Amino acid sequence: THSHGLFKKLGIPGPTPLPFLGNILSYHKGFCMFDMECHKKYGKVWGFYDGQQPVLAITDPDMIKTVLVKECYSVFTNRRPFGPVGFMKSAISIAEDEEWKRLRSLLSPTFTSGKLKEMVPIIAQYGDVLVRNLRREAETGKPVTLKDVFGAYSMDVITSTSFGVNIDSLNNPQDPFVENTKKLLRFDFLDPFFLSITVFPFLIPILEVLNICVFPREVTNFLRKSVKRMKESRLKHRVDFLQLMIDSQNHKALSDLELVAQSIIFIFAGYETTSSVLSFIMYELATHPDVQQKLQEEIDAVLPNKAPPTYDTVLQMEYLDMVVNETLRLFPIAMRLERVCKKDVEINGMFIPKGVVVMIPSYALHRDPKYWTEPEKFLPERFSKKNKDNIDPYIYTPFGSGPRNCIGMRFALMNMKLALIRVLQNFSFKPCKETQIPLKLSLGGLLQPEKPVVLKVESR
Ligand code: HEM
Ligand SMILES: O=C(Nc1cc(C(F)(F)F)ccc1-n1ccnc1)N(Cc1cccc(O)c1)c1ccccc1Cl
């Protein structure tokens, strides 16, 4: 069509698009397979169309640094709009340009290492809860699906960190927080709805005037009311995500609806993501028990006699840092990094026209043989103390990079590591007969396993 000749004029290789559809039919193998395929068949830079939207993929480390870090505030500042957002347009991950710079300033101190150290005791409290509910499942003599145990854990930390709500999600699935928040699963961008709106971006403004929100509106209105009630209910900082935005509420000021929007994004950002990575980590520990043994030995060394973890101790365990990093290399759940080019610009000898989405194939780079030897093998020694300097930080980007990287990286890493320390110091995980030995990945818009990971759990 009239927008499909762009990459031909610039002389950029890519699959030939179809009218009205672009290359979305090539998504039948999934985002990951499509990205790795184009990397093999086109080299270091290629292009394709999500409907009428042109997308340029870049793999040069210098270009990635220019897009994500150097020319970030000037050119590559925002992400592609993804659908009808409603009042959630004020969320930090959805805000654009000056509003984003303001909100990120108003929210950066919330994710300081100092504030994270003050959050460790609260998160550790539900590590003991996870172990208690894990032992009962171990006594059943039957395999357990890790998504439910970790999802229960990830919910308990989120509620206790975002608010003061202490809950046992696995045993108390009735509290209004547990019910509504359990409907904040990740967005399958290859489903009929999202595939439709990428082909029909003109329908996004229509959906907004019908008050059709991409987030379930019942959960949003419930959460807005609960925050409005809790603000009066405390009208003892307790290292509370909501409180840290209330005391900071008194650049510019953070509004009440803005505060509500950020709180929901933190719940959304850390419920399935935390549980998914924790499930991937345990799968690789079962199929590679030598790693699990050394990790279980390192946990006992730093924290003897099943000692509770600490900010100073978690940041000390080196082999635990290797297991999370290598799992995030194999399974970067974002799969991709996107920036919208807001003006004509030339980067590293390449012309990027206005309006083109620049894409960085994190999954494709993480499994590229030109940077990783035996990429499919899960060798956690890639990040040893003497081999962790060879890795290019712009090829391995599990949390993104630049001033729009993950704002909750330290929390997520701490939260996951605190969970791993407590569970491996009491249990061992064995591959049962209901476990997929190859672990086929899903073909949709999510980086999740095809079948849920079920493993045998024994007590130590
Ligand atoms: C293991 C879990 C997580 C992973 C793998 C992850 C990864 C990412 C990635 C790749 C991005 C995009 C950065 C880019 O565009 O360059 C991002 C953005 C973001 N993440 Fe996470 N994330 C995780 C958990 C969390 C959690 C628990 C929070 C809660 C505070 C959080 C808050 C955010 C925010 C606020 C952004 C948007 C930053 C901005 O737009 O300025 N993330 N994350
Ligand atoms: O933005 C992402 N997630 C996200 C989205 C929302 C929102 F939609 F409601 F606004 C809210 C929270 C998060 N969230 C999850 C973990 N931390 C932040 N990404 C990366 C990404 C995706 C697409 C384009 C792009 O440039 C960057 C992500 C991260 C981990 C797993 C899966 C994803 Cl899709």
Could you explain how this protein is built, in words?
With 460 residues, the chain is of the alpha+beta class. It has a single domain, classed as Cytochrome p450 (Orthogonal Bundle). Helices cover 45% and strands 9% of the residues. The chain is built from 18 helices and ten strands. A five-stranded mixed sheet has the order 1-2-8-5-3. Helix 10 crosses helix 12. It is globular, with a radius of gyration of 22 Å. The protein starts with 5 loop residues before the first helix and ends with a strand. The structure holds protoporphyrin IX containing FE (HEM) and the ligand O=C(Nc1cc(C(F)(F)F)ccc1-n1ccnc1)N(Cc1cccc(O)c1)c1ccccc1Cl. The site of the ligand O=C(Nc1cc(C(F)(F)F)ccc1-n1ccnc1)N(Cc1cccc(O)c1)c1ccccc1Cl has 14 residues, from helix 12 and strand 5.
* Structural class designation: alpha+beta
Helix count, DSSP H or I runs of 4 or more residues: 18
**What is the fourth-level CATH superfamily?**
Cytochrome P450
Tell me the number of structural domains.
Answer: 1
Bound molecules: protoporphyrin IX containing FE, the ligand O=C(Nc1cc(C(F)(F)F)ccc1-n1ccnc1)N(Cc1cccc(O)c1)c1ccccc1Cl
**Computed CA radius of gyration, to the nearest angstrom:** 22 Å
Oligomeric status of the shown chains? monomer
Based on CA inertia axes, which overall geometry fits? globular
Q: Percent helix among the residues?
A: 40-55%
- How would you spell out the order of helices and strands? HHEEHEHHEHHHHHHHHHHHEEEEHHEE
What name is given to the CATH topology?
Cytochrome p450
Strand content: 5-15%
Biggest sheet, strands in spatial order?
1-2-8-5-3
For the termini, the CA-CA separation is 63 Å
